[PDB]
Amino acid sequence: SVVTKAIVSADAEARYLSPGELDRIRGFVSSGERRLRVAQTLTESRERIIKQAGDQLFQKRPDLVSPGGNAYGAERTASCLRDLDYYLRLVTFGIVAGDVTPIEEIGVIGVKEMYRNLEVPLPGMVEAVKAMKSVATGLLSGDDSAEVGYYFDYLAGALA
Amino acid sequence: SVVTKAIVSADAEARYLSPGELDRIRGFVSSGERRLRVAQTLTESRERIIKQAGDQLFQKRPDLVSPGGNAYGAERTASCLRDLDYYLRLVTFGIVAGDVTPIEEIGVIGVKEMYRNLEVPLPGMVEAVKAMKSVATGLLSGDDSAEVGYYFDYLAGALA
Amino acid sequence: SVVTKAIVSADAEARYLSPGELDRIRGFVSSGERRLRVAQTLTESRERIIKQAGDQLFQKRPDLVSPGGNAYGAERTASCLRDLDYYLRLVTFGIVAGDVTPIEEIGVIGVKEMYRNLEVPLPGMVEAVKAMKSVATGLLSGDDSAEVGYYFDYLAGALA
Amino acid sequence: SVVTKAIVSADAEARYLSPGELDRIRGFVSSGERRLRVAQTLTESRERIIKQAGDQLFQKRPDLVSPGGNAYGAERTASCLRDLDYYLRLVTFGIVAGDVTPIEEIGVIGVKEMYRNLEVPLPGMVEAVKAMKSVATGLLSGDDSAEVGYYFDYLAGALA
Amino acid sequence: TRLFKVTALIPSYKKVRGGRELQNTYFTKLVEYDRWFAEQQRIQKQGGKILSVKMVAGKPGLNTGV
Amino acid sequence: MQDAITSVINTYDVQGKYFDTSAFDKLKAYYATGELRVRAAGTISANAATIIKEASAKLFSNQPDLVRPGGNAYTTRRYAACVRDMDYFLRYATYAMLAGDTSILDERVLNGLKETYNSLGVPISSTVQGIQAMKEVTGSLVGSGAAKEMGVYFDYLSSGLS
Amino acid sequence: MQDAITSVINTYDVQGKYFDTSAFDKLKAYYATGELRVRAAGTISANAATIIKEASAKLFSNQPDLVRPGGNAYTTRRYAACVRDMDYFLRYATYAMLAGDTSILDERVLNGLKETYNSLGVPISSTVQGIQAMKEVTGSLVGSGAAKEMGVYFDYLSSGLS
Amino acid sequence: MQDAITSVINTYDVQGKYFDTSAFDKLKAYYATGELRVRAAGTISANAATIIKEASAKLFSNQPDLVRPGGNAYTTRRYAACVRDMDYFLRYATYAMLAGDTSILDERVLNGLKETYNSLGVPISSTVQGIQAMKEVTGSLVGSGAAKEMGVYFDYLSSGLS
Amino acid sequence: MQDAITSVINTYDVQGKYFDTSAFDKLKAYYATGELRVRAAGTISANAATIIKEASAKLFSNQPDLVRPGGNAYTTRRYAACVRDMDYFLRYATYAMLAGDTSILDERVLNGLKETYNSLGVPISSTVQGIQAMKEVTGSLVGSGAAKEMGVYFDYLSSGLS
Amino acid sequence: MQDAITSVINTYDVQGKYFDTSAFDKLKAYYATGELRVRAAGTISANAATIIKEASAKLFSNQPDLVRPGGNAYTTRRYAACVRDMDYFLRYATYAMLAGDTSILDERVLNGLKETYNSLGVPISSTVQGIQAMKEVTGSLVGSGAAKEMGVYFDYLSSGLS
Amino acid sequence: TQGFKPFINAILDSKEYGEVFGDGTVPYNRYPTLPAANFPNTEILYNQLT
Amino acid sequence: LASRTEFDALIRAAYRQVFERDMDSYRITEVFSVLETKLRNREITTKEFI
Numbered sequence A, B, C, D: 001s002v003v004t005k006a007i008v009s010a011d012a013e014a015r016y017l018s019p020g021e022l023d024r025i026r027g028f029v030s031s032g033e034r035r036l037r038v039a040q041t042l043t044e045s046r047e048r049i050i051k052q053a054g055d056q057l058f059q060k061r062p063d064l065v066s067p068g069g070n071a072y073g074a075e076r077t078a079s080c081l082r083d084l085d086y087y088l089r090l091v092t093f094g095i096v097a098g099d100v101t102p103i104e105e106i107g108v109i110g111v112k113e114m115y116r117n118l119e120v121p122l123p124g125m126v127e128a129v130k131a132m133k134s135v136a137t138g139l140l141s142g143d144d145s146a147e148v149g150y151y152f153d154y155l156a157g158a159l160a
Numbered sequence E: 001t002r003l004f005k006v007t008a009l010i011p012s013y014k015k016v017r018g019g020r021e022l023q024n025t026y027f028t029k030l031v032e033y034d035r036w037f038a039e040q041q042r043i044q045k046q047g048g049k050i051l052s053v054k055m056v057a058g059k060p061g062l063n064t065g066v
Numbered sequence F, G, H, I, J: 001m002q003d004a005i006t007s008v009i010n011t012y013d014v015q016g017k018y019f020d021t022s023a024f025d026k027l028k029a030y031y032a033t034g035e036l037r038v039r040a041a042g043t044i045s046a047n048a049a050t051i052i053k054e055a056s057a058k059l060f061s062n063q064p065d066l067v068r069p070g071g072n073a074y075t076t077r078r079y080a081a082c083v084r085d086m087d088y089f090l091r092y093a094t095y096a097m098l099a100g101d102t103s104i105l106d107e108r109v110l111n112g113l114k115e116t117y118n119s120l121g122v123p124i125s126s127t128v129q130g131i132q133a134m135k136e137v138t139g140s141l142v143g144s145g146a147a148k149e150m151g152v153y154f155d156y157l158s159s160g161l162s
Numbered sequence K: 001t002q003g004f005k006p007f008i009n010a011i012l013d014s015k016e017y018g019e020v021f022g023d024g025t026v027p028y029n030r031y032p033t034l035p036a037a038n039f040p041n042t043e044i045l046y047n048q049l050t
Numbered sequence L: 001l002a003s004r005t006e007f008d009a010l011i012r013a014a015y016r017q018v019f020e021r022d023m024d025s026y027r028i029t030e031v032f033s034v035l036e037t038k039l040r041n042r043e044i045t046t047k048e049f050i
Ligand SMILES: CCC1=C(C)/C(=C/C2=NC(=C\c3[nH]c(/C=C4\NC(=O)[C@H](C)[C@H]4CC)c(C)c3CCC(=O)O)/C(CCC(=O)O)=C2C)NC1=O
Pocket: A064, A070, A071, A072, A076, A077, A079, A080, A081, A083, A084, A086, A087, A106, A107, A114, A118, A120, A121, A123, A124, A125, A128, I060, I067, I068, I073, I074, I075, I076, I079
């Protein structure tokens, strides 16, 4: 998180954290309460977000569920929705952390190799993530939508 | 400056500033007015702060103005107070800047070599900046006195 | 010693000792009796040298034994003289060694951070070793006083 | 020379010359006159030394001056004696320098490549240098003969 | 002292490399004494786990000859 | 590097002067513009890929020879390096605008860029054209006042390259 | 390393569960204590040299043989290495206090320090005494709550060496 | 580098001549001055920090503007860099004196100094004045015989700078 | 590494013998198998990504817990590392088959794999199951004859891992 | 490394006492033999290649199977490694003789040598016999007292290997 | 302050060396795109003979 | 014992990178013979050799 980055930056120079870094951490802990409120809101709306996101993805990209598509079949569509659930959990982790570092460590490093081996189309990932972003931002207020959409934007850029 | 550290940190990672760093800059920009008021309070009283810190220094360390002491003599004592005024100016600079970057670049890098070439004791410098901290935090309300004491503490730690 | 320095210089290049290195070893061993007599002379007179050097130390810089000074007090004065005893022993070691490596590795490497941790002024310590130099060279002949003064000069330059 | 080695070694550590280094240079310059008269002895009788060394080399190694040998003929034998004369002058240079450095740059670096390109056998060089060692040391006194023999030994080891 | 024999595992977190990296993760090396602080700090900063360090050349507790 | 705050600090540090009323007015002006600067920086950061796409599209439409075989932007390496340089220019223009000071543009962009490009055969006029296309795209996204401010830093880059 | 937030993230990630109520309770507990941690860290940073000097004085007064000839801390070099070790211990304990987790002590302090000291011949009990001295000196400076918090990481260091 | 002995050796080696009487006279002169040079080098090694202190004090007394705000040596960093440059000049002058040859001042010192100083805005005139200040202090320290010898190398450094 | 030919050469060099009838016979055996080996290596080279896909699919179908949270293949990084390791095993088995000798497996793959996996926490039994899964898939493509020969090196890798 | 002088200094320093009469006695013993050691070292360096040639010829005459096919010294590579090892032993034994102390031997030769030779398959006994051949050649070449001195360090190497 | 060997150690103990070259690869010309002017300066250095 | 040639190529590449060209005239092989020996038997890494 922000605290870990400040600590590792200070340790790189073999120094204590400067008053500026301490002030940055103070602002971070101040914003923590709103961050947990946002993450709680997205955690409560698990099944909704997954359901509308999957429906928009499958209507926008029928080929994925059609014969020959990567998600054809009940079990493969279930795995698709399971991946969506993974990424939504990662986005909640990013919201609490204040940065995209947990998303980066769990679901972004080596994702292209994983989906190459799985024969998962990356544009399908990008569209599913965009649909998740739309649903999540819709279920939120005007303020929360910006910071939540930032993480989905980072994730889609990582897939794209 | 806060903006300078944010930009440099982003540049070191070859990236745009994240919403967290932009929010940090937004908070610093918001608190700029309070910072300017504190800086003016410390500037308008610089003569009193210097006189009282010099006093407290010379009661707490009589050896400095005692024979064999570095500050012995009216001329050397004037140089002592002139250094104290340099550091008070740098403290006001660091207040408006929001970090200790001006303090470090103007008065901390190579200060050990300079004072060694000058035969100036560093515990004397630390006691003098502690004196200035006491005097200057006496002039301020609690919230502002804490943030000024942070810069004075950084100065004392960098001299020690 | 001189032998160790020649051997490591030869070893770094995977060679035998050059005629110059062997020549300097001969010069060292042929001078062994004279420098050994010098080391004895410094050894028997160690108490007298330490006490005169400490007296000259306190006369020249009285802030150390003045209030607010590092050597203020009786036990701190005993520790002051104990350090001088240490350095005179190291000087004898350097004389028998023919080089300043024993001094460097027992009492010079890390000395700045040590005396910084003890709030011991390095100008005061340099005055200490200069007093020791004057006293010790007083008890020696000119030919011996030259070499002993060279080691004391090395110590003075290294301390500050 | 001795002075140049001391200076570059001290400059490698960003320091002044140690008491041992200064003592070494002092002993070197105190011995300058015996070095100069040894160079006198070697220079004033260089023709006889080269002639006798050539005789000893060609008697212990008749193959060189036999047909098919590297030194066969008038001109190749002249070139052989010319190389011996080169190395004698180099030994005088090293004697005055106090170290094998002038020998090392003028006649040791790349000597193996040179003599392979010329098809001069290196054991022949070693035998010639040993012969010239014996002839030149026969002309000097024991103290000087040992010192010059160390230079001839350095040369032989480099050719070996 | 003059020599530490250090066996260390350095995993990878930043990326999965095309190179084999069996060379660089699990290793044993000889680091000279006044390099060991910096080397250990770098190994800890990369995220590795130092498995063992041993004395090989010098003698612990010696004053001279260091 | 420098920002507006550091620039005022330096001009009052060379004179050994405490801050006057004029310096406090300059600091107030920067602190007033800070919100607009952060807004523009966030907008540009969210839209960097869009800006690069559009600007490189205009550049290669006007100078098609750059991407025809043999042109300086003809290979996947050289096209990628071209759009990477455009991304660099956008990023450092955004840094400069957020700092309120063009010192970063000289220190971290313009220093040796001219003879970098001349030693590589990168056309400098076409790079300036790309920068102008980038300025036009960015102005439409950040709004009129932010467009005028961002034009200053884009024009600083263009003038330093020219 | 991982802080408290990253710690709970990793723990809930390993079971692949979303944050429960208890996870948000833990996060609220951390963010509530963060400001106290920032005062504690700033205070310790201001007085690092003082803390190390007092702790070293206490350690070498309670164990005078360490710095007398024959002791592990007898030379300028070995004494300086000792006080360097205590400086690093104090700064890393400050880091672990800000993070709210003893992980950084595992990755960047205890990661091979045990057997490094063992091969060096550094006495463990004396190093524990030095850590305890830093603990008392630092607590008397940072007050009761920050003292308990810092002491937790100090005893982590002691038990890691023990 | 190159010293007096090595200079004579190379001069005769290019000619391919054994040493004549003139070469032995030059070597005799250097051997005769060797004791004076060693004594002077020892004195300077013993008092180098002192020499730097009085030389810097004298230079900043003659030109107080250098260390007052606006001067090139005004900050802690630039004051320390000034003192470090003076330490270079003193140490390399002592090397050249002990060598009896100004070559090392050519390789290690004067090569590219003008370019560095004009790039940094370091005032070359004031640096020459500081070199002169070191010359008086060092000459007064070493004595009548060695002061003339060390002046050669200090003025060589000054003429290379100016 | 050594191939079959280099193995025969080394076994004749150790005894200092020129080649007799038996050595030429073993050589002829290798050059008889050479066309089969080259054909199998080319077939696998064309189908490497595929064979990896079915091998990983079989490994994860038979042991699903490896990729759910808590499994060592649970992350994109760790899943990518797993398939990377499997690709390495396939590539080096192909090298060994083409060479006709198993020295390359011990020299490159197996030298330090136990220490690395056990320190990392990689489960050996699952990796061995992956070796078998890869062998079964490859045998279907290479052909009945080449399948056993490639299985030889696959069991060599497994037993070295086991 | 430690010579005799540094060994005495280290003992008296860890005792923290000034030199006693026995310390000065050991120092006189060392200085007395220094000229003999320097002569022996110069003689050995003058004849190092000759010593290695005769010692290796004696070793491979007493054990011809070492360089015949199947022996550990049969190749140009391994024969070169053998004679290079003998060169190391000779040079470091000369170092130890000149130092008057064996600490350089176990510091820079003996540490890990037996394990390395065993891992390589180098016969320890044959290496000991090579050291003995070097001992005999060197002892015949230097002279009786220097023979005894060098034999001390050669026997140290032999006892460390075996 | 420290001379040559500490300076070489400072280079080789830098984080940059560890990330780019690690412990196994011989260094090489990097043709660095960043920071500004590093490319021309590096190329001038590497286009010069000894 | 095996892959001797690729160690030797890496060693000569290290010489050419650190010293900008081959240095056989200076007998680099015998100057660094112990160092090369430690590199081949894997006591040290490439970074320590450099
Ligand atoms: C926590 C981080 C993480 C991620 C993200 C992850 C992804 C992941 N998805 C998988 C399967 C899958 N994933 C998908 C999803 C795709 N189908 C369509 O193409 C869509 C575009 C797209 C969904 C939006 C499908 C269809 C499979 C089944 C693959 C197969 O059986 O061939 C698998 C194989 C193991 C299993 O099925 O349980 C992994 C490891 N694993 C992780 O540890």
